[PDB]
Amino acid sequence: KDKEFQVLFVLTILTLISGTIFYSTVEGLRPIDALYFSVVTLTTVGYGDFSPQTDFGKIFTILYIFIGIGLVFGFIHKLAVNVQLPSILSNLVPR
Amino acid sequence: KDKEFQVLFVLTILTLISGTIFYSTVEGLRPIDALYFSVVTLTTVGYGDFSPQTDFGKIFTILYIFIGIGLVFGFIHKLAVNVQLPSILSNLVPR
Amino acid sequence: KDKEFQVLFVLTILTLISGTIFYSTVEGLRPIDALYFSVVTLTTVGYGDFSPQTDFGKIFTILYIFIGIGLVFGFIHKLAVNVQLPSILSNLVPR
Amino acid sequence: KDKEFQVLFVLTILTLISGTIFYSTVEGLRPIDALYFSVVTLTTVGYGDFSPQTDFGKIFTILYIFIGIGLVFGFIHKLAVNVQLPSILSNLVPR
Numbered sequence: 001k002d003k004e005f006q007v008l009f010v011l012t013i014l015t016l017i018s019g020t021i022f023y024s025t026v027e028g029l030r031p032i033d034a035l036y037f038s039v040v041t042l043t044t045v046g047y048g049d050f051s052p053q054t055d056f057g058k059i060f061t062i063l064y065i066f067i068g069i070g071l072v073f074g075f076i077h078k079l080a081v082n083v084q085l086p087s088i089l090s091n092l093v094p095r
Numbered sequence: 096k097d098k099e100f101q102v103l104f105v106l107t108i109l110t111l112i113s114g115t116i117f118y119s120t121v122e123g124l125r126p127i128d129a130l131y132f133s134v135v136t137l138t139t140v141g142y143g144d145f146s147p148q149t150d151f152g153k154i155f156t157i158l159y160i161f162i163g164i165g166l167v168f169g170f171i172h173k174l175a176v177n178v179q180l181p182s183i184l185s186n187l188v189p190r
Numbered sequence: 191k192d193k194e195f196q197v198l199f200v201l202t203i204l205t206l207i208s209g210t211i212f213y214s215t216v217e218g219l220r221p222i223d224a225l226y227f228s229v230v231t232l233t234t235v236g237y238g239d240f241s242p243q244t245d246f247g248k249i250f251t252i253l254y255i256f257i258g259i260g261l262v263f264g265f266i267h268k269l270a271v272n273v274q275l276p277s278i279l280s281n282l283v284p285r
Numbered sequence: 286k287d288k289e290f291q292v293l294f295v296l297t298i299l300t301l302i303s304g305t306i307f308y309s310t311v312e313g314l315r316p317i318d319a320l321y322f323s324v325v326t327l328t329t330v331g332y333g334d335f336s337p338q339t340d341f342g343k344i345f346t347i348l349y350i351f352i353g354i355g356l357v358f359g360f361i362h363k364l365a366v367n368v369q370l371p372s373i374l375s376n377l378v379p380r
């Protein structure tokens with residue numbers, strides 16, 4: 001279960017690095033903005049303060065969403081159930 | 096399970112084609128933008144760089160969301176569990 | 191299961207009517223725009239082509255989201271599993 | 286189950302207070318706008334009428350989303366199943 005978490009963590013980082021490199025390069029964003037945009041996209045928040053302007057970028061974004069959402073939300077689920085929940089329970093019992 | 100995936104894949108493509116034809120025609124978008132907008136809508140990202148301006152478009156979008164979200168997210172779930180997950184597991188074991 | 195669906199359908203309509211009346215009145219939107227905005231909000235798409243400008247509207251929106259998401263997505267789930275899925279299966283078998 | 290709900294309720298309030306203090310301070314928002322923005326972010330609506338403009342804010346938002354979504358949606362789930370659903374069932378049976 002901690003190996004579950006480690007693998008999803010690594011896969012999430014790799015997915016976000018991919019988006020960061022793509023949007024910096026093709027859409028001209030600063031790397032920090034490309035990372036922020038990738039996260040805002042795959043978590044489905046979608047502020048729209050950044051959005052792709054090129055057709056290459058729009059096509060990549062379609063594929064990136066379909067491939068990336070399942071992973072990101074898998075990681076969020078495991079983070080909440082396997083890390084946050086036990087730490088919350090631990091705080092309820094003094095030692 | 097591969098037939099599960101094939102059917103949801105075909106249904107997702109048909110749903111996206113419907114949106115592409117509607118928004119190109121009624122809202123005047125380029126076909127690639129109409130496809131991109133349909134995906135950004137049904138995955139609930141919603142950047143808002145495109146949004147419907149006509150009342151016909153707003154009404155269609157209401158119905159398209161309610162009909163389309165369940166399918167799209169069904170496909171994403173099956174993609175992640177039935178395709179991405181086994182390929183990830185396969186990479187962990189050399190042959 | 192059809193009574194499950196009927197009840198969630200009615201509750202979803204009532205929830206959307208509430209939002210339509212509120213945003214038309216307090217935020218000055220046309221009724222069709224208030225309905226469209228309510229749907230775009232509770233399905234979490236959030237284009238931002240409309241958003242509340244008054245403090246009353248921002249406060250209402252906070253509460254409306256927390257109360258409304260669970261219902262709307264309950265209805266979407268039942269629509270997809272109890273209505274769309276059987277109709278899709280029915281199309282695969284000629285009579 | 287009512288203690289389940291109480292704990293998630295308190296944790297949700299604390300999470301929203303954190304965001305309210307951060308975005309008011311670093312991004313200069315009025316407290317009510319910072320609260321509204323925090324809710325619009327963690328429920329994944331993401332209108333984009335507010336969005337972070339500083340790099341500190343963008344970095345915080347990335348972490349806030351990953352930590353906050355699992356909690357918020359846990360609370361929404363329990364609200365809908367453990368509070369809204371029984372009250373709806375209660376209305377169907379006069380006394």
Ligand SMILES: [K+]
Nearest residue numbers: 044139234329
């Ligand atoms: K969303």
Ligand SMILES: [K+]
Nearest residue numbers: 046141236331
């Ligand atoms: K959005």
Ligand SMILES: [K+]
Nearest residue numbers: 045140235330
């Ligand atoms: K969104």
Ligand SMILES: [K+]
Nearest residue numbers: 047142237332
């Ligand atoms: K937006």
